[PDB]
GDP-L-fucose synthase (Campylobacter jejuni subsp. jejuni serotype O:2), 696 residues
Amino acid sequence: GGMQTNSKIYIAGHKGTAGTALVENLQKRGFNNLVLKTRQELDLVNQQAVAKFFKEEKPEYVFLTAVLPCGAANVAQRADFIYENLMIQNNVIHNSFLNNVKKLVFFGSGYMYPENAKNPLKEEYLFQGDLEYGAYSFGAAKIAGAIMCESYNIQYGTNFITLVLNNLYGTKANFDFGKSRVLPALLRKFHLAKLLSEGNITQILQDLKMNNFEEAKEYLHNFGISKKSVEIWGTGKVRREFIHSDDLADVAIYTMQNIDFKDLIKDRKSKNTHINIGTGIDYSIKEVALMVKNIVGFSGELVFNTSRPDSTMDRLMDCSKIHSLGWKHKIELKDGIKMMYEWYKTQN
Amino acid sequence: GGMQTNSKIYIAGHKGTAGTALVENLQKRGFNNLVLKTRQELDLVNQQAVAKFFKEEKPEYVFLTAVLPCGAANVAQRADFIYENLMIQNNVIHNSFLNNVKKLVFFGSGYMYPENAKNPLKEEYLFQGDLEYGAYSFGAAKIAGAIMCESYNIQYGTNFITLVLNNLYGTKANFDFGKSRVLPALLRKFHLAKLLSEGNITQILQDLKMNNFEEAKEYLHNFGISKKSVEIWGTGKVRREFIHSDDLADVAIYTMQNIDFKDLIKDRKSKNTHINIGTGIDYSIKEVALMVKNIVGFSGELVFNTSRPDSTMDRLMDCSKIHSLGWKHKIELKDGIKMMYEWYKTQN
Ligand SMILES: NC(=O)C1=CN([C@@H]2O[C@H](COP(=O)(O)OP(=O)(O)OC[C@H]3O[C@@H](n4cnc5c(N)ncnc54)[C@H](OP(=O)(O)O)[C@@H]3O)[C@@H](O)[C@H]2O)C=CC1
Ligand SMILES: NC(=O)C1=CN([C@@H]2O[C@H](COP(=O)(O)OP(=O)(O)OC[C@H]3O[C@@H](n4cnc5c(N)ncnc54)[C@H](OP(=O)(O)O)[C@@H]3O)[C@@H](O)[C@H]2O)C=CC1
């Protein structure tokens, strides 16, 4: 009946934001029989390496967090987003089946839903219109991962569950400036703005990768940071939903212990058995940036540059299905950002 | 203008219905430099074997015809349809790019289009609604195939074209009942029912490769074959489009010679760069069956078994795009069935 304290657990991609929170929350709950492989010891795109790993380690449970993620900086990698994510998904999912994995959890993305779908997004809005253009191939790969899980559950009686989320953040998130995840990057930008407005050359230099402070200030300004203001592109009315990675780990563990494919099936032709996860509430980028600015204590202005349009669709999950299955989020956004900022300050 | 007589051409899946016609057409047209590998010498799902083949063979052009087809007999293989076809597509397309293949042609399916799309199906109907339940995971795989070709073309400037077709038949078809498509299967059914009505036990045993007539008669009845009737599972009302594999080979070769990715993009609106191929004409399964019945000369009647959840989905391509690009079909259905039947009695 679900995971046991001695169950062998593989968290794929365990160094990422979701993966780190899954490791720490599993062991806080008493599950420490973990199998972990960094990218350098196991390239999940390589089918031979993945098949060898599953044959040797025989994990009983799998949390598949590894991804090549679509972001504003790397959007040109249209081919890589579909190839690499399809290969990770196929390799891990099929080899879990071959080696009699008990349950698996795969994480979907809100980019799998049509660009013009109604918010809040229901699980049955899959395939109801075209995907957003920049995330088109990434979203198609996420669709194929969700359909793969379901197709293995139907043909082979596996228990492979897809949980779909929008924006992740966490106590120990990826604040690196290249793969610019929305909430961690906003937090760091207001933190650097506060350090700049205080005249703190050293901690800026340490917090950045850099040794030339004039180069640092130019780098700050490219991201809208100034002594007396933070400027962000757009109207500020684009709306986003966020989930703290402790809540991500909480629902993923709850799914392992409680939600089986039979719990999701329709009366006949069962489809759309993926489950949305999230907090069910969204905020405008203006409301989020202001919450970060207050938590950080930056004294300067918040400015929205409406000359270059934000373009983006709103994304908010309808979480009524996971609620009915017995799980709801524990961390509200203001409390979650405060957790993230306290860890961030005690870091470098 | 592209492939030359001495260009090295790889036809993946060369022993199949599409692949056999492509091979004979290429050879008879003077292309003397073909690489062919059976499934036993090259498993296209195995990434390691495929990467070795391209690295060590360096084909210049690729026709990707290998597939796990979705038919009425194997509809239960819902997981194999998406995993196996995704792996074949991923391995061949990516290792083509990795080894500087000049051009590739991939075959999509009309199951990639929404079940309730209007007919004739336009290329832009991709993602405008859900897929039919039986072909769902197969159609999702074929969607990802078409999107990967386009994505590699966009990011890397490859020249990977997707041609999308509905029902395939051909002169040297697979008649083997475990995998045979609906037109070759109907052909063998009426032929067998004709032999049964004529009473020649010996020829039935030879066609079925059986040495017990009581087992033979049980096998025929279970496939709906009798002295006085052939039954078909369905209403017989659904309308489908068929293309003969010689026409498929012709348009695949015509595409390789004439149609480039740069021809397919309307500037910034580069999406739906797949191309429908077909004959532009529909037939109900009832119309097809008694056309087959009259060509084999069976004296009996059709019988329809209604079944709990029949397809109800028509499939007919809109071919305006390929027609404007300079190709039209040549082989009408009645002529193609007669070609197939003449080859059939050559084997039996
Ligand atoms: N974060 C978000 O805002 C969203 C997250 N999700 C989903 O949540 C899941 C995890 O997200 P997140 O935690 O943000 O992902 P991260 O990008 O933070 O971490 C991903 C992990 O995958 C590893 N990885 C990538 N490619 C390979 C590979 N070929 N072989 C081995 N390891 C590899 C990376 O390793 P390295 O660090 O060495 O590259 C990294 O540790 C993903 O499925 C993602 O799509 C869904 C929607 C949005
Ligand atoms: N038939 C129809 O009505 C429809 C057809 N299509 C299109 O038809 C195209 C192909 O037509 P067709 O040629 O008739 O399909 P077939 O199944 O007739 O041919 C498939 C070929 O690929 C080979 N193959 C399959 N898997 C592997 C593998 N893992 N390694 C090596 N070889 C493999 C098979 O070999 P083996 O014999 O060893 O399996 C066979 O020779 C597909 O791309 C599909 O899109 C689309 C929609 C409907």
About this structure: Residues 66 and 347 of chain A are 24 Å apart (CA to CA). Residues 78-98 of chain A form the longest helix (21 residues). Residues 170-240+281-315+332-348 of chain A form one domain. Chain A has two domains: 1-169+241-280+316-331, 170-240+281-315+332-348.
